[PDB]
Design a protein around this ligand. Structure first.
Ligand SMILES: Cc1cc2nc3c(=O)[nH]c(=O)nc-3n(C[C@H](O)[C@H](O)[C@H](O)COP(=O)(O)O)c2cc1C
Ligand code: SF4
Ligand code: SF4
Ligand code: SF4
Ligand code: SF4
Ligand code: SF4
Ligand code: FES
Ligand code: FES
Ligand code: FES
Ligand SMILES: [Zn+2]
Lengths: 156, 555, 554
C-alpha cells in the first residue's frame, strides 16, 4: 500500500548500504518516518525494524514526528549563539509554546535547531519554510510569528 | 577530451577562446554561494534574468561561487570592467542594468566600502582586504562559474589530471605530494603523502577514496564554500588520488543539510562522466574510476574516520578503536584513503606547479595557504584565505576590517568546540601546525569566531559542552557520561549555583574525559573548559562569588 | 615473552591479541567492565587504562611488544578509574535489593571494592524504559549499554529485535519505537537475559502466585523438567548428583506440594506420538520435512518467519503442555476432583515456556511456570540444606520415564527419542551422523524395510535460516532455540556460558545413564495411559495435539 516507497526501494535495490538515502527520500515524501513505513522498509529489505529505528534515531535529519506546517529552524552555531540565538529560542518558546524538537498539537509549527547555515554575517538567523532572517531579536521574532499566525487566520 | 589528450587539448583551447570572448563581452556574475543567497541573491538572479528576457538583451548571465565578502550583501560583478557591486537588491535591477550594462557609468552607491579607509572602492582587486589575502585556492573571485565543467576546463582544469594519468606515475605523484609537504587540512595536520603511501602499499586489489565534506565545526562553513564554488577541483583531486593509490571507487560524503553543495557535486560528477573523465576508461589509459555522492544525515561524530566509514556503509556512525587504521582496512575492510575536501583541492594546485613554487607560501614546515571562515562582530566577515605564517591580528584587522563600533577583542575561537580559545596574548603568533600545537592551541578545521567583551567565557564553554553532549555517539563511558556531567556543572555555573568543589570536580573530570575517551570527539570535548580555565579562571571565580563579569548570564 | 609490569619482569604468551588478555592469562587482572559474558567486546568501559611510555591508554587495545614497560596502577589511573565508575553509578538505578542480578553483579562488586560511598556526580534524569509485558522483563535504568544482549539476539539467536537507539546521554538499548516486547518478533528465548551482566534484563518472577496457591485449599501439582535437575546445583555451589530430582521431590512435598510428576514422562509421551505422526507423514510423503514443535521459542519464531512451514510443524504439543493436559483432563477425573481444583506448577529451564503456557491454545492448563532460578529461590528461602535432603521418587502414575525421554533436556534428545521409538517398532539398520558445522548434526537413517530418511538437529536459532536455505534433502528437523538445548535455557542459573552448559549436558547424560527403561514403549505407565485414556484417535488429537497460526503486525 506504499507505491512511492516501493519505487524508492527498487531504485536502490533494497541494498543495505543505501538505507540512509532511502530513509531521507521517505522522509521527504512523508515529512517524517512513520512506524508503518519503517515496518514496510524492514519487511521489504529484510532488515529487522530495530536496526532501522537505531539508524533513524542516530542522525539529526530524521524525525519521528510529523513536521509542522511552518517548520521553524533557528541556527545555533557559534556566531549566532554569541549573537542572541538563545533569545530567539526563548521568544519562540514563549510565543508559540514549543521546545526544539517538537511540533505544536495543531501541527502549525515545529521547532528544530541546526548548525551554522553559512550566514553568520546576519547572526542570529532563523528560517521558516526556507525563508531566512537575520539580526533577529525577541521582539522581531514575536512579530514574525504573530504576523504569520494572523495570515493563517484569514483563510479559515 | 573523451579518449585521448590531443582532443582534450583541442577542446580546452576552444573553451579558452570562448571564455576569453566572454570576458571581453558584457556579462553578469551573481554570487550564489551561501550567505549571498541568504541576503536575497536568488531573487537578484531572477530579477536580472527576467529583465534580460523582457529587454531582449548575447549577454552571458552566470552563477559564480563565494567571493569572500559574504557580509557585503548579494554581490554582482560586471565582466568587461570589473565593477563588482555589493548589497545589490532585487528592487534595483533596472537601474544597474541601464546604467552599467549599456552606458557604462559606475554606480558609486552599490560599490564596496572599505572599512579601513571608509571609501567605496570600485574594484575588489584594489581593496586592501583582497590584497592582504593570499589566494591560491580561491581563483577567479567573482568572475568564475560553479555549475559548469566547460568554464572549469577553460580555466586550465583537469590538465593536471591529464598530466597525472598520461605523463607521471602513481609513485611519482605520491612522491611529489610527499615532498610538497601537504598536511591534512581537516584539522589533524597529518602529512598527506605518508597517508597516500600507507593506502598504496596496503595489501589488496580494491581500494576506495573518501572525501570528508564535513566542516568539523558547527560554526564554520569554509569546506561547504569550497564544495559550492569549484566542485570540479575537488573532483580532480580525488581522481588524482584514486589513480595514485590505485583505487577504483570513491565517495564524497556531504551533509544533506547543505543542498546546494550536494547538487553542485552531483552535477559535476555527471559532467565529468559525460566527457569520459570518469568511467570504464579515462584517456584510454586503462584506469577506471567512478565517484559517488554519499549524503550525510547529520552527526558531528561522522567527521571521525571510522564513524565516517560506518555511516557510509549505512549503519550508525559509531567509531571503533583506531588500529587497524582505515588505510589498511576501511570500507568493507578494503584499504581506504580519507582526506578533507581542502586537501583534495590542494592536490591539483600542487600538481599544476612544482614543489618549489608550492613551498614559497607558508613556513618551512607549513607550506601553502589555508581557508578560514570568520564570524562574530567585525566590519568584514566571511571566507578568507591566507598564507601559513599569518597571525590572528593580521586576519582580524587587515583582512576582516576590525570590530564594529562599540566592540573590542576579548577572545577568539579557532577550531570550534574541539579548537582552542585564545586570549589577547596569543594574537602575535603566526598560524602554524607547530607553533600553536606546542603552545596549547591549533589552527583547527578553518572556522574562526571572535568573542567580544559582551560575552561570558563560562557561557561559551557551556555552549560547546552542550553541543558535545548532544553529539556524543554514546559508545564509551568517559564521553557519554562525562560530557553530560560537565555540562551539568557548567549550567550550575551559569545559574549562580556553583561552588569551589564544583570547579575541582570539573577540572578532574576534564582530565578523565580527555585521556580516557575512545575517539577524538570525546578527547577534545573538554578543550573549551581547559582553555577557558587557563585563560579566564577569574571569570569562573566571579561566577562562584555571585556576579557575572559581563552581563549575559541571567544572574 | 618478556614484559615489565610495575617494574617487575613478567613472561606472557608470544602471540596474544592485546595486553589485557595476556596479563589475565598470566594471572594479572586489570579492572574493567567490558569482559562480562561470552558475547562481550572490548573498548567501551575505558577502565583498563595502563601507562606505557609515560602515556595512558587502554590495555584491551594494546598489542604487547618485547621489553614494554607498563604501569598498571598510578595515582592518575586510580583517579580515572574511580571517576569512570562514579560516572556509571551516578546514572545507574541503584536498587540492588530488588535486582535480579544482586549478588552476581560485577558493577555491584566494583562499587563495593572501589569504596564508592557518595555519588559526587549528579543522577541526571534519563528517559528510562520499563517493560513488563513479557516473561523477559526490561528495565533500561540498570543497563550499562555493554551491548552484549544486542549481539546475542542478532548474531546468536538470529532475531535482532533489540538494538541501540538514539545517541549520547540518551543512548538506550530498546525495541523499535519502544514497542512492548510481547508485541514484537521476540521469541522469548531469554538468551539476552542469560548474557546480561546487570538486572536490566530479567525473568518475570512468579513466586508470589505459587505461595498464594499453596496457601489455599486447592490441589497443587508440580512437574519438573529434565534440564532443571542437571543445573540447579550451581545455585547452591555444590557438585552435581543424579539424585537431584528426587531431592527436589522431597523438598516440594515438604513445602506442601500434593503431587510431583516428571515432565520426562511427558517427553516419552510426546516422542511416542511424534514418531507415529512422522512415520505416517513419511509413508504418504505429506507435510515434509517435519519440524519438531517441542521448543516454543522455535515455534513462535516459525509463526513469525516461516508461515509456509506451519503445517510442516509437528502437531503434537510440547512435553509441558502434553503432560499438563493429561493431568488436567485424565488424572483429575481419575482422582475424583474437579479440574478447577488442580493448580499445576511447571518447573522449567526456559522463559519461552512461560509464554507457551499462556498461549490461547493452552489457556488454563498450566497455572504457573517457574524457572530453575525461581525454584532455587524457593529452596534458599527455606534455608533447607538441599544436599542433605533424603530423596524420594516422583509420584505415580507420571513419575517414571525412559532415558530417551530424559534426554530431551539437551539438544538432539527428542530426535534420539523418536529414533528409539521407530527402532523399537520398525527396526533401524544403521545411522550415519554428520556434523556440517558447530551446532548442526545430520543423520542418515535406514529402516529395516527401506524408506530411509535424513534428520537434522539444529541448536541455536539463527543457524536455522541458513540451514533451511541450503538443505532440501532432510525429512525431519529438530530445532532448539538455545545453544546446547534446554541445559542452556534462558531460565537456567547465571552465569550461563558454554563451559557451564557443557557441564550441565554431562550431568544430564550421567543422570540418563542410571535409568533402566531404554525406550518409551518400555514405560508401562505410558502404555497403560494410552490403553486406558488415549485409545481413539479423537481423544488423542484432543489431548496431545495443538494448532499454530501466523504472526504479523500491522
Ligand atoms: C568529531 C570529529 C569530526 C571530524 N570532522 C572532520 C571533518 O569534518 N573533515 C575532516 O577533514 N576531518 C575531520 N575530522 C578528522 C578526521 O578524523 C581525519 O583526521 C580527517 O578526515 C583526515 O583528513 P585530512 O587528510 O584532511 O586531515 C574529524 C575528527 C573528529 C574526531
Ligand atoms: S568519545 Fe564520545 S563520540 Fe567518541 S566513541 Fe566515545 S562516546 Fe562515542
Ligand atoms: S545491576 Fe542490580 S545488583 Fe548490579 S549495581 Fe545495578 S542494581 Fe545493584
Ligand atoms: S528473548 Fe531472545 S529473541 Fe527476545 S530479545 Fe532476548 S535474545 Fe532476542
Ligand atoms: S540490557 Fe544488559 S546486556 Fe544489554 S546492553 Fe544493557 S547491560 Fe548490556
Ligand atoms: S531450547 Fe529449551 S530452554 Fe531454549 S527456548 Fe527451546 S525449550 Fe526453552
Ligand atoms: S553560526 Fe549561524 S549562520 Fe553561521
Ligand atoms: S557567498 Fe557570496 S561572497 Fe560568500
Ligand atoms: S576493557 Fe573496557 S575499554 Fe578496555
Ligand atoms: Zn556569565
Amino acid at each position: 500500500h506504499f507505491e512511492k516507497v516501493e519505487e524508492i526501494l527498487k531504485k536502490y535495490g533494497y541494498k543495505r548500504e543505501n538505507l540512509i538515502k532511502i530513509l531521507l527520500e521517505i522522509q521527504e515524501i512523508y515529512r517524517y518516518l512513520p512506524e508503518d513505513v519503517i515496518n514496510y522498509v524492514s519487511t521489504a529489505m529484510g532488515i529487522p525494524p530495530a536496526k532501522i529505528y537505531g539508524v533513524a534515531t542516530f542522525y539529526a535529519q530524521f524525525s519521528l514526528k510529523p513536521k509542522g506546517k511552518y517548520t521553524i529552524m533557528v541556527c545555533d552555531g557559534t556566531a549566532c549563539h554569541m549573537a542572541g540565538s538563545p533569545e530567539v529560542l526563548k521568544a519562540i518558546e514563549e510565543e508559540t509554546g514549543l521546545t526544539p524538537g517538537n511540533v505544536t498539537e495543531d501541527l502549525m509549527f515545529s521547532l528544530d535547531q541546526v548548525g551554522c547555515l553559512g550566514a553568520c554575517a546576519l547572526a542570529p538567523v532563523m528560517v521558516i519554510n526556507g525563508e531566512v532572517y537575520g539580526n533577529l531579536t525577541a521582539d522581531k521574532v514575536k512579530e514574525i510569528l504573530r504576523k504569520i499566525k494572523e495570515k493563517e487566520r484569514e483563510s479559515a | 577530451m573523451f579518449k585521448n589528450a590531443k582532443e582534450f587539448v583541442q577542446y580546452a583551447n576552444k573553451l579558452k577562446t570562448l571564455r576569453e570572448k566572454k570576458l571581453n563581452g558584457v556579462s553578469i556574475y551573481v554570487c550564489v554561494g551561501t550567505g549571498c543567497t541568504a541576503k536575497g541573491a536568488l531573487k537578484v538572479y531572477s530579477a536580472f534574468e527576467e529583465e534580460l528576457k523582457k529587454r531582449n538583451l548575447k549577454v552571458t548571465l552566470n552563477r559564480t561561487g563565494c567571493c569572500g565578502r559574504c557580509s557585503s550583501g548579494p554581490l554582482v560583478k560586471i565582466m568587461p570592467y570589473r565593477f563588482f557591486y555589493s548589497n545589490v537588491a532585487p528592487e534595483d535591477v533596472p537601474e544597474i542594468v541601464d546604467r552599467t550594462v549599456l552606458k557604462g557609468e559606475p554606480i558609486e552607491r552599490l560599490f564596496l566600502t572599505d572599512p579601513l579607509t571608509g571609501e567605496k572602492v570600485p574594484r575588489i582587486e584594489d581593496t586592501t582586504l583582497f590584497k592582504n589575502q593570499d589566494f591560491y585556492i580561491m581563483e577567479a573571485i567573482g568572475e568564475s562559474e560553479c555549475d559548469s565543467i566547460e568554464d572549469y576546463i577553460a580555466r586550465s582544469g583537469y590538465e593536471s589530471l591529464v598530466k597525472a594519468l598520461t605523463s607521471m606515475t602513481p609513485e611519482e605523484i605520491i612522491e611529489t605530494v610527499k615532498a610538497s609537504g601537504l598536511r591534512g587540512r581537516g584539522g589533524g595536520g597529518f602529512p598527506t603523502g605518508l597517508k597516500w603511501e600507507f593506502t598504496r602499499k596496503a595489501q589488496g586489489d580494491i581500494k576506495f577514496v573518501v572525501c570528508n565534506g564535513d566542516e568539523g565545526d558547527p560554526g564554520a562553513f569554509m569546506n561547504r564554500t569550497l564544495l559550492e564554488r569549484d566542485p570540479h577541483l575537488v573532483l580532480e583531486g580525488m581522481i588524482i588520488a584514486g589513480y595514485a593509490v590505485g583505487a577504483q571507487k570513491g565517495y564524497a560524503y556531504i551533509r544533506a543539510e547543505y543542498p546546494f553543495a550536494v547538487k553542485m557535486f552531483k552535477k559535476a560528477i555527471e559532467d565529468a562522466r559525460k566527457l569520459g573523465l570518469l568511467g570504464e576508461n579515462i584517456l584510454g589509459t586503462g584506469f577506471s574510476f567512478d565517484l559517488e555522492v554519499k549524503e550525510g544525515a547529520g552527526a558531528f561524530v561522522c567527521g571521525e574516520e571510522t564513524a565516517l566509514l560506518a555511516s557510509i556503509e549505512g549503519k550508525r556512525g559509531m567509531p571503533r578503536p583506531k588500529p587497524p587504521f582505515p588505510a589498511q582496512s576501511g570500507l568493507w575492510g578494503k584499504p581506504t584513503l580519507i582526506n578533507n575536501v581542502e586537501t583534495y583541492a590542494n592536490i591539483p594546485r600542487i600538481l599544476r606547479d612544482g614543489v618549489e613554487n608550492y613551498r614559497k607560501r607558508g613556513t618551512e614546515n607549513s607550506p601553502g595557504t589555508k581557508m578560514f571562515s570568520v564570524a562574530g562582530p567585525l566590519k568584514a566577515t566571511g571566507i578568507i584565505e591566507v598564507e601559513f605564517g599569518t597571525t590572528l591580528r593580521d586576519i582580524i584587522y587587515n583582512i576582516c576590517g576590525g570590530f564594529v563600533e562599540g566592540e573590542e577583542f576579548k577572545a577568539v575561537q579557532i577550531g570550534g568546540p574541539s579548537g582552542a580559545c585564545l586570549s589577547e596574548d596569543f594574537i602575535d603568533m603566526p598560524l602554524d601546525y607547530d607553533t600553536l600545537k606546542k603552545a596549547d592551541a591549533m589552527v583547527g578545521s578553518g572556522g574562526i569566531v571572535v568573542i567580544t567583551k559582551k560575552t561570558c567565557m563560562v557561557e561559551v564553554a557551556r555552549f560547546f559542552l552542550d553541543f558535545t553532549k548532544r553529539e556524543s555517539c554514546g559508545k564509551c563511558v568517559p564521553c557519554r557520561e562525562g560530557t553530560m556531567q560537565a555540562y551539568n556543572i557548567l549550567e550550575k555555573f551559569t545559574h549562580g549555583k556553583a561552588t569551589y568543589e564544583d570547579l575541582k570536580t570539573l577540572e578532574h573530570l576534564s582530565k578523565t574525559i580527555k585521556t580516557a575517551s575512545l575517539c577524538g570527539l570525546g578527547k577534545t570535548a573538554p578543550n573549551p573548559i581547559l582553555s577557558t580555565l587557563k585563560l579566564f579562571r577569574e571569570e569562573y571565580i566571579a561566577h562562584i562569588e555571585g556576579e557575572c563579569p559581563s552581563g549575559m548570564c541571567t544572574a | 615473552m618478556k614484559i615489565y609490569v610495575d617494574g617487575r619482569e613478567v613472561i606472557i604468551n608470544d602471540n596474544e591479541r592485546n595486553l589485557l588478555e595476556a596479563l589475565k592469562n598470566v594471572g594479572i587482572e586489570i579492572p574493567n567492565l567490558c569482559y562480562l559474558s561470552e558475547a562481550s567486546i572490548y573498548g567501551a568501559c575505558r577502565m583498563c587504562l595502563v601507562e606505557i611510555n609515560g602515556q595512558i591508554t587502554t590495555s584491551c587495545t594494546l598489542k604487547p611488544y618485547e621489553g614494554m614497560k607498563v604501569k598498571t596502577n598510578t595515582p592518575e589511573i586510580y583517579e580515572m578509574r574511580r571517576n569512570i565508575l562514579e560516572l556509571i553509578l551516578a546514572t545507574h538505578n541503584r536498587d540492588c535489593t530488588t535486582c535480579d542480578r544482586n549478588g552476581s553483579c560485577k558493577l555491584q562488586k566494583y562499587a563495593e571494592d572501589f569504596g564508592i560511598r557518595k555519588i559526587r556526580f549528579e543522577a541526571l534524569k534519563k528517559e528510562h524504559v520499563r517493560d513488563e509485558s513479557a516473561p523477559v522483563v526490561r528495565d533500561t535504568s540498570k543497563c550499562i549499554l555493554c551491548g552484549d544482549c544486542v549481539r546475542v539476539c542478532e548474531e546468536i539467536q538470529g532475531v535482532g529485535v533489540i538494538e541501540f537507539a538514539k545517541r549520547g546521554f540518551e543512548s538506550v538499548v530498546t525495541t523499535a519505537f519502544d514497542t512492548p516486547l510481547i508485541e514484537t518478533e521476540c521469541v522469548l528465548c531469554g538468551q539476552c537475559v542469560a548474557y546480561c551482566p546487570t538486572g536490566a534484563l530479567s525473568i518475570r518472577n512468579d513466586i508470589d502466585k505459587l505461595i498464594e496457591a499453596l496457601e489455599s485449599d486447592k490441589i497443587v501439582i508440580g512437574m519438573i523438567a529434565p534440564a532443571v535437575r542437571a543445573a540447579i546445583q550451581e545455585e547452591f555451589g555444590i557438585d552435581e548428583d543424579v539424585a537431584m530430582a528426587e531431592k527436589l521431590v522431597s523438598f516440594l512435598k515438604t513445602i506442601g506440594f500434593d503431587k510431583v510428576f516428571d515432565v520426562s514422562f511427558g517427553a516419552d509421551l510426546v516422542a511416542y506420538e511424534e514418531a507415529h505422526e512422522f512415520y505416517e507423514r513419511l509413508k504418504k510423503g505429506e507435510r515434509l520435512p517435519q519440524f519438531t514443535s517441542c521448543c516454543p521459542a522455535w515455534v513462535k519464531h516459525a509463526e513469525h518467519t516461516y508461515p509456509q512451514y506451519l503445517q510442516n510443524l509437528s502437531s503434537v504439543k510440547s512435553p509441558q503442555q502434553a503432560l499438563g493436559t493429561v493431568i488436567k483432563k485424565i488424572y483429575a477425573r481419575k482422582l475424583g476432583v474437579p479440574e478447577e481444583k488442580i493448580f499445576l506448577v511447571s518447573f522449567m529451564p526456559c522463559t519461552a515456556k512461560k509464554f507457551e503456557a499462556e498461549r490461547e491454545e493452552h489457556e488454563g492448563i498450566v497455572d504457573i511456570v517457574l524457572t530453575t532460578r525461581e525454584l532455587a529461590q524457593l529452596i534458599k528461602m527455606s534455608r533447607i540444606d538441599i544436599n542433605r535432603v533424603e530423596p524420594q521418587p516422583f509420584d505415580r502414575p507420571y513419575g517414571v520415564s525412559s532415558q530417551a525421554g530424559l534426554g530431551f533436556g539437551k539438544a538432539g534428545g527428542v530426535f534420539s527419542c523418536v529414533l528409539s521409538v521407530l527402532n523399537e517398532e520398525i527396526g533401524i539398520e544403521k545411522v550415519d551422523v554428520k556434523s556440517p558445522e558447530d551446532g548442526i548434526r545430520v543423520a542418515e537413517v535406514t529402516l529395516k524395510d527401506g524408506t530411509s530418511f535424513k534428520g537434522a538437529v539444529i541448536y541455536g536459532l539463527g543457524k536455522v535460516k541458513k540451514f533451511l536455505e541450503e538443505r532440501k534433502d532432510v525429512e525431519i528437523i529438530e530445532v532448539m532455540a538455545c545453544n546446547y538445548g534446554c541445559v542452556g535455557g534462558g531460565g537456567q542459573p547465571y552465569p550461563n556460558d558454554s563451559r557451564i552448559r557443557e557441564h550441565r549436558a554431562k550431568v544430564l547424560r550421567d543422570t540418563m545413564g542410571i535409568k533402566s527403561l531404554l525406550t518409551p514403549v518400555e514405560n508401562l505407565f505410558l502404555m497403560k495411559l494410552y490403553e486406558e485414556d488415549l485409545k481413539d484417535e479423537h481423544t488423542r488429537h484432543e489431548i496431545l495435539h495443538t494448532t499454530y497460526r501466523p504472526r504479523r503486525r500491522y
